[PDB]
């Protein structure tokens, strides 16, 4: 019984970690896109000035 | 008595030379941009992967 409970806990933790990794990758892609757009706007403003 | 002011004014061009030539009695020539170029170097660093 204890081994089954521990296995279920480990499986739940693994699923949670997979979801966390997916959400982290999505958020990092979004942040990278935002930073690229910010750098482009900065370069444009500097050139215009 | 400002350094950054002069550094930023140096990019405005040689208008002071034309002003001095006009004050001395020499007419200002009306031509295209054969001495000033709107060039850029794009010294922006690369984003970390």
Coordinates of C-alpha atoms in Angstrom, one line a residue:
Chain A
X1 CA 0.0 0.0 0.0
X2 CA 2.8 2.4 0.9
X3 CA 4.6 1.7 -2.3
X4 CA 1.5 2.2 -4.4
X5 CA 0.8 5.5 -2.7
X6 CA 4.4 6.6 -3.3
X7 CA 4.2 5.6 -6.9
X8 CA 1.0 7.6 -7.4
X9 CA 2.6 10.6 -5.7
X10 CA 5.7 10.4 -7.9
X11 CA 3.5 10.1 -11.0
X12 CA 1.5 13.2 -10.0
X13 CA 4.7 15.1 -9.4
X14 CA 6.1 14.1 -12.8
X15 CA 2.9 15.3 -14.5
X16 CA 3.0 18.6 -12.6
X17 CA 6.7 19.0 -13.6
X18 CA 5.9 18.4 -17.2
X19 CA 3.1 21.0 -17.1
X20 CA 5.5 23.4 -15.4
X21 CA 8.1 22.9 -18.1
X22 CA 5.6 23.5 -20.8
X23 CA 4.3 26.7 -19.2
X24 CA 7.9 27.8 -18.6
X25 CA 8.8 27.3 -22.2
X26 CA 5.8 29.2 -23.4
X27 CA 6.5 32.1 -21.0
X28 CA 10.1 32.2 -22.0
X29 CA 9.2 32.4 -25.7
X30 CA 6.8 35.2 -24.9
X31 CA 9.4 37.1 -23.0
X32 CA 12.0 36.6 -25.8
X33 CA 9.5 38.0 -28.3
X34 CA 8.8 41.0 -26.1
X35 CA 12.5 41.6 -25.7
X36 CA 13.1 41.4 -29.4
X37 CA 10.3 43.9 -30.1
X38 CA 11.6 46.2 -27.4
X39 CA 15.1 46.1 -28.9
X40 CA 13.7 46.8 -32.4
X41 CA 11.8 49.8 -31.1
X42 CA 14.9 51.1 -29.3
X43 CA 17.0 50.8 -32.5
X44 CA 14.3 52.5 -34.5
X45 CA 14.0 55.4 -32.0
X46 CA 17.8 55.9 -31.8
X47 CA 18.0 56.0 -35.6
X48 CA 15.1 58.4 -35.9
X49 CA 16.7 60.7 -33.3
Chain B
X1 CA 30.6 74.6 -20.1
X2 CA 29.0 71.3 -21.0
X3 CA 30.6 68.2 -22.5
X4 CA 27.6 66.1 -23.5
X5 CA 25.9 69.2 -25.0
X6 CA 28.8 69.7 -27.3
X7 CA 29.0 65.9 -28.1
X8 CA 25.3 66.0 -29.2
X9 CA 25.7 69.3 -31.1
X10 CA 28.6 67.8 -33.1
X11 CA 26.1 65.5 -34.8
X12 CA 23.9 68.5 -36.0
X13 CA 26.4 69.2 -38.8
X14 CA 28.5 72.1 -39.9
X15 CA 25.7 74.7 -39.7
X16 CA 28.0 77.0 -37.7
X17 CA 30.3 77.3 -40.7
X18 CA 27.4 78.3 -42.9
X19 CA 26.3 80.9 -40.3
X20 CA 29.8 82.3 -40.1
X21 CA 30.1 82.5 -43.9
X22 CA 26.7 84.3 -44.0
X23 CA 27.8 86.8 -41.4
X24 CA 31.0 87.5 -43.3
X25 CA 29.1 88.3 -46.4
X26 CA 29.3 85.0 -48.4
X27 CA 26.0 83.6 -49.6
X28 CA 25.0 80.1 -48.6
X29 CA 25.0 77.6 -51.4
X30 CA 21.7 75.7 -52.2
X31 CA 22.6 72.1 -53.2
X32 CA 22.0 68.5 -52.2
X33 CA 23.7 66.5 -49.5
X34 CA 27.2 66.1 -50.9
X35 CA 29.0 66.4 -47.5
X36 CA 26.5 65.0 -44.9
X37 CA 25.4 61.4 -44.9
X38 CA 22.7 59.8 -42.8
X39 CA 24.7 56.6 -42.2
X40 CA 24.4 54.2 -39.3
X41 CA 26.6 51.4 -37.9
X42 CA 24.0 49.4 -35.9
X43 CA 26.3 48.7 -32.9
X44 CA 23.5 46.9 -31.1
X45 CA 24.7 43.8 -29.2
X46 CA 23.4 40.3 -30.0
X47 CA 20.8 38.9 -27.6
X48 CA 21.9 35.9 -25.5
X49 CA 20.5 32.6 -26.8

